[PDB]
Amino acid sequence: SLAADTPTTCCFSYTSRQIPQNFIADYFETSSQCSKPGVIFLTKRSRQVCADPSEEWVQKYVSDLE
């Protein structure tokens, strides 16, 4: 799109539910200098969504994106 050429972001809160795994295309990690930790998931529809990296599903999904 390319999603890698969109601006960096920070998260203030996180999605409330587990996103279906086959719907996730990529991920980005927000800066450690952001006020809170954050993983951004990019869905197949090009939506960027904040997620909490302390959550198990989040790490699993990050890992499975190789």
Add this chain to the structure above:
Amino acid sequence: EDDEDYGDLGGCPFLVAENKTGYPTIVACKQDCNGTTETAPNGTRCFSIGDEGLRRMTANLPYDCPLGQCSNGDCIPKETYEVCYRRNWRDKKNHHHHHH
């Protein structure tokens, strides 16, 4: 199980600009994503440039960015500016240098 069950996905990311050393500051005090809107906490540092302001910036060059604080979803200017930069995800990725 926590917090919303089946409403909108939410988790609107806030676009940031960074200073030379990478410290980020949001460019809008409110973000919309699908049916959701989120406001940054009152008192948060912000640049009053907007998401479209940021998307207009050439990546990785310095701009003078007006600084404010958020108040009820709006960035209220102070009398100060900070040099800020648009970075994209590409600028943060992979590892093409190493040392032996």
